[PDB]
C-alpha cells in the first residue's frame, strides 16, 4: 500500500563531536585569527523539543580548553625569553622596619645581569616577591630554575578577559537549554538552536567564579554526582558579589635591555608606604550568598542537618588560594575570611592577597611566564558569579574552596550548550509511488 | 517561517513544509579549514546518496520500494500527524541501512529497464 | 457537526457565466479534499469537478473540461465553482463535497464522506 | 568560441550560447588550501541554489515564477539584444533576492503537487 | 557483490552491474586536509562534466551523439562480451576528448531546442 | 601556453590605489624574505 | 633478487630471504647512567 519516500533537509538530529570556530567582534587571546561575529545573532526557539544535556561529557569544553592553552602559547612566543634571568641573586629585605603583614615580602635582590654587548655586564637592583626567590644557602635564585626557562610576557599585551564566541561549522548547530533551573544534566524542554553561543569571556580563576554569568532565579548547584565527594560542586549565583581589590603599592618599574632588542622589566622601587595587596566583600552580601547556598545544598544533602563552610585544603598556592589575573598582574587570596562559618538547621571581609611574579599556569611543568610590573596602583571591581566546591569525606557536611581542573571553570559557562550534527536525510512511508 | 529546525518539534507533515531551510543552512587555519571540508564532505556524500537513488534534484523523492511493515507498523495518521521527524527517526533507525541498500538496487534496475526501452526504435 | 451550505444563482440563459459558491464548517477546511457532483433532475449522480485540499491541483469531467473552473479560498473555508457556456445539459442540481483525494501523506479517500444540499442550475 | 568570459561583451542573446565555457571554469599551503575549498563553497552554493529550485541539471531552467514588471519593464528586444548581461546584472540587482525567494516556493508548491499527483492510482 | 573495483577484470557488459560501488568510492596534517579537498575537486569536476552533458542524476546516461565508428570499429558483441573497460580505455583514449566536445554541443542544442517548445502557448 | 581573452565590449573602473592586490604582494614578499633569512646563521655572538 | 638492471653494476640488488635468519645481538655491558641538570629545565644524560 505504502511506498518510501525520501526526504531531504529533515529537521533531526544527533549528539556529535566536531571542530568549533571562534568568532568575535593587543590582548593574549588572537582576536586578529578569529572570525568576526554576526552583529545581529538569530536564536530559533524550539517550541515541542526537549532533548537530553550532559555538561559532564560536553566536548566543547574541552575543545576550549584546548583553544585557551594554544592562544597563550602563541601570545608568549613572539617575547622576550628570559634566559639570563637563572643566576645567583644577593638579597636582603627591602624594608627592615616594616611591622605590617607585608613583613618578609619584597626582597631587593642583586645581580650581575647581561647588557646589549656580549662583553660588558651590569649590576641591576630589583624587588621580587618572597615567592619568586628560593634560597641557595643571602643567595637565592628564582623559583622557577628547578624546572624551566622563563619567557617574559609582552608589556604591549593586555591579559583583560574580552568574550570569545564559539561558533558552529555549517551542518552542525548548537542547542540552548533555556531552562531557569537546569542542574547541568537531564532532559531540557526549553531548547532552541543557535548556531553560535554568546560571548564567554575566558576569566582565569580558583575557588571562585568571577563575572562570566548568573543564573536567573535562584542559586544552581551542579555536579557530575553529589554522592561522591571527590567531584566538584560548580555553584552558580542569583546574585553577583562585588569584590573590591587592589595592589595598593605604587610601583616605579625600570627596563634594562639584555640582549639586542631583548629588554628586561623589573620593579625597581615602590614609592611611599608599602602595603599589602588585598580584596573587600562585603559582610552583608556574603551571608546573603552563603544562605541561598546553604538552603540549595540541604536540598541534596538533607535537612535538619549540619553544613560548614572552612578554609582549603593544603596543596599548590594556586588551588589553595583564590588565583586570579587583576591588570595583568596575579593575585593569590587566602579567602578564610569568607569560609569560616558554620550553618546549622560597610563592614566588609578584608582577604589578603599574594603577589607572584614567576606563574606556572595550566598545571603544566616545563613552561614559566614572567608577568612585568604595572606602574601604579592596581584596582579591579569584578562580580563573583559562583564557587567551586568540594567536600570532606554523618550528620554534618563540610565543605572547602576548591579548583585547579581550568576546564570546571568553562563547564560552568558552556552548561547550557549541547553540538549536535544535522542529519538533513530521512525516509517514511507515503502513498506517493514513483512513476514507472 | 521558523527558520532553521524550528519545525524540529512540528510534526512530520506540517515539518515537510521546511525541507529547504535546513538544506541552505548545510553549506552556509587548520581547524576551520577542516571544519569546511567537513561540512562539504557530508554534503557531498548526502548528495551522492540521493543521486544513486535517482533523487539527485528533489526534495521530496518519490519511489518504488515498498513498505515492508516490519520497518515500522504505524498507519499514515499515526506518523505524519502524530509523530516528530526526531521520534521518526530513532524508530526506523535499525531498518535505515536495509531501506538505503534497496533504494540502490531500485534505481538501479530503473536505469536499466530506461536503457532498453530507449534502445526500441 | 459538519455542514455545507451552497449559495448562488438558480436560473441563467445559454452561454452565461454563474458562479456556486459552498461554505463549510464544522471541520478543517484545509485538510480536505473537495469536489462537485452533479444531478439531472431525471438523472442519477455525475462527478463534475475535483480540486484538492491546497487548491493547486484541479480535475474536471471532460464534458465541462474548457468551459468550468473550481477554486477554493481557505482562510475563508469557501469553495467556488465558476462555469462558463452553461449549454443546457448542464441543466441540474449541483453538490459539493468533502472527499475524493489525499494529499499523499494522509489516508485515501476516493469517496464523498460528506454531502451539502445543493442548489439547483436552471439553463 | 570567444574564450572564457569572452562574452560579457556580447549581448544576453549571443552570451547566452556560451554558458558552458564560464561553467568549466568555475572549477578549473594555507592560502592554496584556503582559496580552492572556497572556490568550492562558492560552486555548491549555486548548485544547491539551483537543486532547490529545481533546476539542478540545467544550464539554462525555465521555470513557472511570472516576471512581475516592476522588476525591470523593458520588452524582450531591448533586453535580450541591447544588452550585456552586466548591465542587466546591475539593473536586477535590488530585485535578486524577491526573484530567488519566489523561485524557492514555486518549487517546493511543484513537488508537493508531484507528490499528489503520483498518489492517484 | 564483489566489492569495490571486483569488476575491473569482468567484461563491461558485466562491469556495468556495480556503477554504485565505484560511485560511493570516490568520496569515501596539512596533507590531509589537501587530499581531502582534491577529492573533491575530482568529484565535482566529474560532477560538474555530467551536468553540462544533461546526466547529473544518472550513472548510465545515454546520450544523442551518434558513434563515428573511426573512434571503434568493434560490434556490440565485441566491445560488451569480449573486453574490459580497462582495454577499451586504452583503446578509446585518444578520442576521449572529441567525444566529450560533441557532448557538450549536443546538450546545448538540446537545452535550446527545450526552451524554444516551451514558449509555444 | 598562457591564455589572454579580449572582451571586445567590456569598459571597466579601474583603481590602483584600492587594489587589494598589492597588499597580498607585499605580504608575500615579506614572508618569503623572512623565510629565506630564518634557516641562515643568526649572529648573536657577533654583538661585541 | 630485485634489481633495478641487475647488469648495472652501480645499481643496489635487494635480496628478499624466504626463511629469516636469527641474529642475537647484545651490548654487554652494565652502563650505569648519571643525569646532570645543563640549564633551567635542560637535563643532560650520560655514561657515568
Ligand atoms: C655469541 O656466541 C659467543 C660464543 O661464540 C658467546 O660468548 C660466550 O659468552 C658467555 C657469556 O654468555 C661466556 O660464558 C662465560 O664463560 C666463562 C668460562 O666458563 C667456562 O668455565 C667454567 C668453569 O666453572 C664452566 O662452568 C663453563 O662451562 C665453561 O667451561 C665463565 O667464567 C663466565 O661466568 C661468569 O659470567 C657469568 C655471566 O652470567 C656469571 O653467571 C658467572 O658467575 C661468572 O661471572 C661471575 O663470577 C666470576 C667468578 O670468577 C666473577 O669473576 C665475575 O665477576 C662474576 O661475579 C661466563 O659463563 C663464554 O665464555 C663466551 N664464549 C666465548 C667462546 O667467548 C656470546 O655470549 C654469544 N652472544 C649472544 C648474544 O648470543
Ligand atoms: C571582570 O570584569 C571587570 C569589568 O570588565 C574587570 O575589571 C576591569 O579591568 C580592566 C583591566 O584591568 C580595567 O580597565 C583598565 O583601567 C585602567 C584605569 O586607569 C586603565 O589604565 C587601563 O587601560 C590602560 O592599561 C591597559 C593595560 O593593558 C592598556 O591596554 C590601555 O591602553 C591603557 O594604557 C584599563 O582600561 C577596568 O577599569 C576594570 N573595571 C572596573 C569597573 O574597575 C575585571 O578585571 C574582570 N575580572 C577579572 C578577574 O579579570
Ligand atoms: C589564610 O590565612 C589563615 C590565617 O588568617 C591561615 O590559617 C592558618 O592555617 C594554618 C595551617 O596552614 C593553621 O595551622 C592555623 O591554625 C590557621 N590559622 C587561622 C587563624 O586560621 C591559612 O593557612 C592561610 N592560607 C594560606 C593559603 O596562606
Ligand atoms: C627578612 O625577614 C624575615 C621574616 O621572617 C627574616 O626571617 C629574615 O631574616 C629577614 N632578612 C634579613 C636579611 O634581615
Ligand atoms: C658580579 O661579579 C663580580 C666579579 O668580581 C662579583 O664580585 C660580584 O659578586 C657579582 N655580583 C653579584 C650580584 O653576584
Ligand atoms: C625542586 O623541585 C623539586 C621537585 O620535587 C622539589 O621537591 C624541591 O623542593 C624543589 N627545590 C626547592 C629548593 O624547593
Ligand atoms: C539533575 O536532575 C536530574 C533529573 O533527572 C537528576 O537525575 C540528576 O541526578 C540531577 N543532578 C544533580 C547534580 O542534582
Ligand atoms: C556516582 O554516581 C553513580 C551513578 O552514576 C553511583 O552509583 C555512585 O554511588 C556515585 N558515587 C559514589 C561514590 O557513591
Ligand atoms: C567598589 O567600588 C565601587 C566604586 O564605585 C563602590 O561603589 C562599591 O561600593 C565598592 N564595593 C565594595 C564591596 O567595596
Ligand atoms: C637595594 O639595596 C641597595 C644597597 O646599596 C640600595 O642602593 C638600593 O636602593 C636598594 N634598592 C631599592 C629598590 O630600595
Ligand atoms: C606614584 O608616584 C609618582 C611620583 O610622582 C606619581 O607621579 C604617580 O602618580 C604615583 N602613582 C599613584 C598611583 O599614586
Ligand atoms: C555585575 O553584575 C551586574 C548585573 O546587572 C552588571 O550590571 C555589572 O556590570 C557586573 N559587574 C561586572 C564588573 O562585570
Ligand atoms: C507544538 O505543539 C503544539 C500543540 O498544540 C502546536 O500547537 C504547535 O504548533 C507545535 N509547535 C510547532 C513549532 O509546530
Ligand atoms: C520484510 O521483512 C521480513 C523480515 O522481517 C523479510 O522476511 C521479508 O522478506 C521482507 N519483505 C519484503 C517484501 O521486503
Ligand atoms: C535497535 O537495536 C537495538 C539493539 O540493542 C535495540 O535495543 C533497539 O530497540 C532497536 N530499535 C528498534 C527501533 O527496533
Ligand atoms: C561588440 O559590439 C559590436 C557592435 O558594436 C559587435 O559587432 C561585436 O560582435 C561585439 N563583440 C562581441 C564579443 O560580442
Ligand atoms: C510586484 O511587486 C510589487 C512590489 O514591488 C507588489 O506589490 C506586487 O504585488 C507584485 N505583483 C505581483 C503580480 O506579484
Ligand atoms: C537600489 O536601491 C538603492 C537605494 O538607495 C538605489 O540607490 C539604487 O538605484 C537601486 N537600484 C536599482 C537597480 O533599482
Ligand atoms: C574471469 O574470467 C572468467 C573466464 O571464464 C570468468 O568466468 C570470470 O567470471 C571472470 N571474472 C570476473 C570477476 O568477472
Ligand atoms: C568521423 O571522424 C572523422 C575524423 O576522424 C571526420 O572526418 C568525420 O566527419 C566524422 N564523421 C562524422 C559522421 O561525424
Ligand atoms: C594515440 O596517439 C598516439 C600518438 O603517439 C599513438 O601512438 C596511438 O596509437 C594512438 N592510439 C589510438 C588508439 O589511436
Ligand atoms: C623481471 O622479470 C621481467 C619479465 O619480463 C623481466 O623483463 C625483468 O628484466 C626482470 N627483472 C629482474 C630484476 O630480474
Ligand atoms: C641498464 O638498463 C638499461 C635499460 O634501462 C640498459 O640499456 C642498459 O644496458 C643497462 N645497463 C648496462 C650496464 O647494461
Ligand atoms: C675519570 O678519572 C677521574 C680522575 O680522578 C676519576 O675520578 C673518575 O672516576 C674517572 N671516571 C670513571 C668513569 O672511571
Known amino acids: 500500500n505504502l511506498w518510501v519516500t525520501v526526504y531531504y533537509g529533515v529537521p533531526v538530529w544527533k549528539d556529535a563531536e566536531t571542530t568549533l570556530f571562534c568568532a568575535s567582534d593587543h590582548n593574549v587571546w588572537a582576536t586578529h585569527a578569529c572570525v568576526p561575529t554576526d552583529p545581529n545573532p538569530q536564536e530559533i526557539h524550539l517550541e515541542n523539543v526537549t532533548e537530553e544535556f550532559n555538561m559532564w561529557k560536553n566536548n566543547m569544553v574541552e575543545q576550549m580548553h584546548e583553544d585557551i592553552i594554544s592562544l597563550w602559547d602563541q601570545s608568549l612566543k613572539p617575547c622576550v625569553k628570559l634566559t639570563p634571568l637563572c643566576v645567583t641573586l644577593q638579597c636582603t629585605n627591602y624594608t627592615e622596619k616594616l611591622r605590617s603583614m607585608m613583613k618578609g615580602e619584597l626582597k631587593n635582590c642583586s645581580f650581575n645581569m647581561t647588557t646589549e654587548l656580549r662583553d660588558k655586564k651590569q649590576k641591576v637592583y630589583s624587588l621580587f616577591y618572597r615567592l619568586d626567590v628560593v634560597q641557595i644557602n643571602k643567595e637565592y635564585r628564582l623559583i622557577n630554575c628547578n624546572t624551566s626557562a622563563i619567557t617574559q610576557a609582552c608589556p604591549k599585551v593586555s591579559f583583560e578577559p574580552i568574550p570569545i564566541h564559539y561558533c558552529a561549522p555549517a551542518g552542525f548547530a548548537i542547542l540552548k537549554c533555556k531552562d531557569k533551573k537546569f542542574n547541568g544534566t537531564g532532559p531540557c524542554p526549553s531548547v532552541s538552536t543557535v548556531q553560535c553561543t554568546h560571548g564567554i569571556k575566558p576569566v582565569v580563576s580558583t575557588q571562585l567564579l568571577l563575572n562570566g554569568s548568573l543564573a536567573e532565579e535562584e542559586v544552581i548547584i551542579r555536579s557530575e554526582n553529589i554522592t561522591n565527594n571527590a567531584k566538584n560542586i560548580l555553584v552558580q549565583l542569583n546574585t553577583p558579589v562585588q569584590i573590591n581589590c587592589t595592589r595598593p603599592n605604587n610601583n616605579t618599574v625600570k627596563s634594562i635591555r639584555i640582549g639586542p632588542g631583548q629588554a628586561f622589566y623589573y620593579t625597581g622601587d615602590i614609592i611611599g608606604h608599602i602595603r599589602q595587596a588585598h580584596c573587600n566583600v562585603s559582610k552583608a552580601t556574603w551571608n546573603e550568598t552563603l544562605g541561598k547556598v546553604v538552603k540549595q545544598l540541604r536540598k541534596h544533602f538533607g535537612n535538619n542537618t549540619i553544613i560548614r563552610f572552612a578554609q582549603s585544603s593544603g596543596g599548590d598556592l594556586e588551588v589553595t588560594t583564590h588565583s586570579f589575573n587583576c591588570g595583568g598582574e596575579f593575585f593569590y587570596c587566602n579567602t578564610s575570611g569568607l569560609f569560616n562559618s558554620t550553618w546549622i538547621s560597610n563592614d566588609s571581609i578584608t582577604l589578603p592577597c599574594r603577589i607572584k611574579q614567576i606563574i606556572n599556569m595550566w598545571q603544566r611543568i616545563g613552561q614559566a611566564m614572567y608577568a612585568p610590573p604595572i606602574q601604579g596602583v592596581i584596582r579591579c571591581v569584578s562580580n563573583i558569579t559562583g564557587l567551586i566546591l568540594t567536600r570532606d569525606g554523618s550528620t554534618t557536611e563540610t565543605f572547602r574552596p576548591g579548583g585547579g581542573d581550568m576546564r570546571d571553570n568553562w563547564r560552568s559557562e558552556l552548561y547550557k550548550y549541547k553540538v549536535v550534527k544535522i542529519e538533513p536525510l530521512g525516509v517514511a512511508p507515503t502513498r506517493c509511488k514513483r512513476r514507472v | 517561517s521558523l527558520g532553521f529546525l524550528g519545525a524540529a518539534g512540528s510534526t512530520m507533515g506540517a515539518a515537510s513544509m521546511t525541507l529547504t531551510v535546513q538544506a541552505r543552512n548545510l553549506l552556509s587555519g587548520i581547524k576551520q579549514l577542516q571544519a569546511r571540508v567537513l561540512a562539504v564532505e557530508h554534503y557531498l556524500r548526502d548528495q551522492q546518496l540521493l543521486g544513486i537513488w535517482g533523487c539527485s534534484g528533489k526534495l521530496i523523492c518519490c519511489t518504488n520500494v515498498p513498505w515492508n511493515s516490519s520497518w515500522s507498523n504505524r498507519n499514515l495518521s499515526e506518523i505524519w500527524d502524530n509523530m516528530t521527524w526526531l521520534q521518526w527517526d530513532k524508530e526506523i533507525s535499525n531498518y535505515t541501512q536495509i531501506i538505503y541498500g534497496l533504494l540502490e538496487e531500485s534505481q538501479n534496475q530503473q536505469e536499466k529497464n530506461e536503457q532498453d526501452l530507449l534502445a526500441l526504435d | 457537526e459538519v455542514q455545507l451550505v451552497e449559495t448562488g444563482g438558480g436560473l441563467v440563459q445559454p452561454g452565461g457565466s454563474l458562479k456556486l459558491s459552498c461554505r463549510a464548517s464544522?471541520?478543517?477546511?484545509?485538510?480536505?479534499?473537495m469536489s462537485w457532483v452533479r444531478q439531472a433532475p431525471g438523472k442519477g449522480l455525475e462527478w463534475v469537478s475535483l480540486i484538492n485540499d491546497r487548491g493547486g491541483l484541479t480535475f474536471y469531467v471532460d464534458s465541462v473540461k474548457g468551459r468550468f473552473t473550481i477554486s477554493r479560498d481557505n482562510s475563508k473555508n469557501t469553495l467556488s465553482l465558476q462555469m462558463h457556456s452553461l449549454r443546457d445539459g448542464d441543466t441540474a442540481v449541483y453538490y459539493c463535497?468533502?472527499?475524493?483525494?489525499?494529499?499523499?501523506?494522509?489516508?485515501?479517500?476516493?469517496?464523498?464522506?460528506?454531502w451539502g444540499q445543493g442548489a439547483l442550475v436552471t439553463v | 568560441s570567444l574564450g572564457f568570459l569572452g562574452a560579457a561583451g556580447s549581448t544576453m542573446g549571443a552570451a547566452s550560447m556560451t554558458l558552458t565555457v564560464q561553467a568549466r571554469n568555475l572549477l578549473s599551503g594555507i592560502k592554496q588550501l584556503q582559496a580552492r575549498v572556497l572556490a568550492v563553497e562558492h560552486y555548491l552554493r549555486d548548485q544547491q541554489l539551483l537543486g532547490i529550485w529545481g533546476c539542478s541539471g540545467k544550464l539554462i531552467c525555465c521555470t513557472n515564477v511570472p516576471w512581475n514588471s516592476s522588476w525591470s519593464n523593458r520588452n524582450l528586444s531591448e533586453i535580450w539584444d541591447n544588452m550585456t548581461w552586466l548591465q542587466w546584472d546591475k539593473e536586477i540587482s535590488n530585485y535578486t533576492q524577491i526573484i530567488y525567494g519566489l523561485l524557492e516556493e514555486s518549487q517546493n508548491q511543484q513537488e508537493k503537487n508531484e507528490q499528489d499527483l503520483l498518489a492517484l492510482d | 557483490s564483489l566489492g569495490f573495483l571486483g569488476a575491473a577484470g569482468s567484461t563491461m557488459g558485466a562491469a556495468s552491474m556495480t556503477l554504485t560501488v565505484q560511485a560511493r568510492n570516490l568520496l569515501s596534517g596539512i596533507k590531509q586536509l589537501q587530499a581531502r579537498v582534491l577529492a573533491v575537486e575530482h568529484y565535482l569536476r566529474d560532477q560538474q562534466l555530467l551536468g553540462i552533458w544533461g546526466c547529473s542524476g544518472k550513472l548510465i546516461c545515454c546520450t544523442n551523439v551518434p558513434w563515428n565508428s573511426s573512434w571503434s570499429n568493434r560490434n556490440l558483441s565485441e566491445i560488451w562480451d569480449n573486453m574490459t573497460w580497462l582495454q577499451w580505455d586504452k583503446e578509446i583514449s585518444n578520442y576521449t576528448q572529441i567525444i566529450y566536445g560533441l557532448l557538450e554541443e549536443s546538450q546545448n542544442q538540446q537545452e535550446k531546442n527545450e526552451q524554444d517548445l516551451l514558449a509555444l502557448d | 601556453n598562457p591564455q589572454e581573452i579580449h572582451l571586445e565590449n567590456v569598459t571597466e573602473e579601474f583603481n590602483m590605489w584600492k587594489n587589494n592586490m598589492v597588499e597580498q604582494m607585499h605580504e608575500d614578499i615579506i614572508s618569503l624574505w623572512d623565510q629565506s633569512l630564518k634557516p641562515c646563521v643568526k649572529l648573536t655572538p657577533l654583538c661585541v | 633478487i630485485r634489481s633495478e638492471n641487475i647488469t648495472n653494476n652501480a645499481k643496489n640488488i635487494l635480496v628478499q630471504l624466504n626463511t629469516p635468519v636469527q641474529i642475537n645481538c647484545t651490548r654487554p655491558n652494565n652502563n650505569t647512567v648519571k643525569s646532570i641538570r645543563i640549564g633551567p629545565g635542560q637535563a643532560f644524560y650520560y655514561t657515568g
Open positions: 463535497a468533502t472527499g475524493g483525494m489525499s494529499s499523499a501523506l494522509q489516508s485515501s479517500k476516493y469517496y464523498f464522506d460528506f
Open positions: 464544522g471541520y478543517t477546511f484545509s485538510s480536505f479534499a
